[PDB]
Amino acid sequence: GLSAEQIAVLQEQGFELRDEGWEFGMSSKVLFGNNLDRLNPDSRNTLTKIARALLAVDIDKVRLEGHTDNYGDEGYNQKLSERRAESVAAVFREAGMPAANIEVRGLGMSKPVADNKTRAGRSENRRVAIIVPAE
Amino acid sequence: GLSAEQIAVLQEQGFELRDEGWEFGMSSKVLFGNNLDRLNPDSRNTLTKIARALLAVDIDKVRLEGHTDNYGDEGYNQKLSERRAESVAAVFREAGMPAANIEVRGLGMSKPVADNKTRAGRSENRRVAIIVPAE
């Protein structure tokens, strides 16, 4: 389980404890914009600070999951979700996180957090999740 | 939002982060034994240490929630669950927590955490939970 100086850091960064562990989503929109899986460089820093802060307190084990809405090919949403997840993973590596400690899952359309019949609904399902397991 | 020192103390007392806050649960058999809402001496002593720990790091509020299984009259089980939480509240108040910062709830049979079908799940649901709300 996580130590008190860690949990606090997680809380500070915007993490919320859920069933699979501590979770913090960012929208694809903010993360990539018009790109497919290239991060615009502002989101890169945002993702660097985050990773640096976590490693600072010996959190060094994260899972990254990316989802899409249901619009589009089913096969493509899987790849995209996985590639987009990996894009973020590469920023964690480049900051000091043991690659063996990073897990990457493409979850495609299958796992939404909103009704997929709204511009703010569908744009909410387009996201990448940062997960520290509470193990 | 709880600080590292607060969280540290919470973990040392056996609390566990849930959905409604930090939460330590004790079974009714331990707290009450054969009694109704009178705690046995060993329990009051335990509860007093927990209470003093929470005060010594300036915790803002505690909620005390009594639960039963689903055997018996539902209104009796509601009252009992309430009287039982009020027994734990009293110990808090006597340890120096002000009434106004203490929330007492009898929840009867409505929030189980185990299966009422077995003798075991029934004894597990017979508990009073101490919650520190997540501001």
CATH of the domain at A42: 3.30.1330.60
Residue whose structure tokens are 């480049």:
A94
Nearest partner of B50 among B18, B10, B16, B81, judged by Cα: B10
- DSSP β-ladder status, B16-17 and B62-67: unpaired
CA distance B64 to B73: 22
For residue A74 the two structure tokens come to: 């089913």
A51 burial level (CB within 10 Å; 0-12, 13-18, 19+): buried
Tell me the chain B residues in contact with residue A4 when contact means C-beta distances shorter than 8 Å: 4-5, 7-8, 10-11
CA distance B125 to B16: 17
A5, B3: Cβ pair inside 8 Å? no
B5, A4: Cβ pair inside 8 Å? yes
CA A34 from centre of chain: 18
Tell me the chain B residues in contact with residue A11 when contact means C-beta distances shorter than 8 Å: 1-2
Q: In B8-118, at which residue ranges do the beta strands (DSSP E only) sit?
A: 16-17, 21-27, 62-67, 102-106
C-beta separation of B97 from B73 below 8 A: no
Look at residue A46 and give its three-state secondary structure: helix
CA distance A13 to A9: 6
Q: How many domains does chain B have?
A: 1
Query: Distance of CA A54 to CAs A96, A102, A135, B86, Å?
Result: 10, 13, 15, 41
Tally: H helices and E strands in chain A: 5, 5
B30 membership: H or E segment, kind and range: helix B28-32
B2, A11: Cβ pair inside 8 Å? yes
Closest-CA distance, B114 to chain A, in angstroms, reads: 17
CA distance B14 to A33: 45
The CA dihedral of A22, B62, B7, A64, to the nearest 10 degrees, is: 0
Residue whose structure tokens are 């990316």:
A66
CA distance A71 to A116: 9
Nearest partner of A103 among A43, A21, A36, judged by Cα: A21
Query: Distance of CA B131 to CAs A3, A72, B14, B109, B135, Å?
Result: 20, 45, 12, 18, 12
CA distance A78 to B39: 56
A97 membership: H or E segment, kind and range: none
CA distance B83 to B37: 6
Identify the sign of the CA torsion B91, B95, B99, B104: negative
Identify the sign of the CA torsion A110, A116, A119, A121: negative
Task: Compute how many other C-beta atoms are within 10 angstroms of the C-beta atom of residue B69.
Answer: 20
Closest-CA distance, A17 to chain B, in angstroms, reads: 8
Provide the residue range defining the domain that includes A110.
1-135
Closest-CA distance, A33 to chain B, in angstroms, reads: 32
Q: In chain B, at which residue ranges do the beta strands (DSSP E only) sit?
A: 16-17, 21-27, 62-67, 102-106, 127-133
- Measured in angstroms, the resolution is 2.8
A7, B5: Cβ pair inside 8 Å? no
Structure method = X-ray
For residue B46 the two structure tokens come to: 């335990």
Ramachandran quadrant class, B105 (left: phi over 0; alpha: psi -120 to 50; beta: rest)? beta
Residue type present at position B75 = G
Closest-CA distance, A78 to chain B, in angstroms, reads: 31
C-beta separation of A102 from A62 below 8 A: yes
C-beta separation of B66 from B106 below 8 A: yes
Which residues between 11 and 70 in chain B have a beta carbon less than 8 angstroms from any beta carbon of chain A? 11, 17
